[PDB]
Amino acid sequence: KVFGRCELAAAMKRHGLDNYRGYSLGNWVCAAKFESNFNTQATNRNTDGSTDYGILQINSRWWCNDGRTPGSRNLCNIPCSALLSSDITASVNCAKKIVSDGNGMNAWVAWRNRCKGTDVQAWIRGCRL
């Protein structure tokens, strides 16, 4: 499913991402915008044969099992397909582990290149408080 901006902000807020590890909600919404265009079904293959899954494009090389990334790790202990559900719970819980892993949100290349150091609060203006 394709989330609307404010709908996703609300779902993410409800799942505890607002200021998770010091990253305000705008950061997560911006990251989702540029990783997946708010589409829970987004997949993208990487050059190394791993694949990114879901609304935050979580990579099978470390974080989930898709059965076709030899050497993969599955740190979130989930099948990668659970990251494609219209329920973002699995994506959010795995994202919490990722952002705690020491590199913070720099683990998302699109956040680093397109959200970091911008006015991310603009991504939540108009949502209900």
Would you write up a description of this structure?
InterPro entries: Glyco_hydro_22, Glyco_hydro_22_CS, Glyco_hydro_22_lys, Lysozyme-like_dom_sf. Lysozymes have primarily a bacteriolytic function; those in tissues and body fluids are associated with the monocyte-macrophage system and enhance the activity of immunoagents. Has bacteriolytic activity against M.luteus. The protein is mainly alpha-helical and 129 residues long. It has one domain: Lysozyme (Orthogonal Bundle). It contains four helices and three strands; from the N terminus they run ααβββαα. It has helices at 5-14, 25-36, 89-100, 109-114; strands spanning 43-45, 51-53, 58-59. It has a three-stranded antiparallel sheet with strand order 1-2-3. A hairpin with a 4-residue loop joins β2 and β3 (58-59). α1 (5-14) packs across α2 (25-36). It is globular and about 45 Å long. The two termini are 24 Å apart.
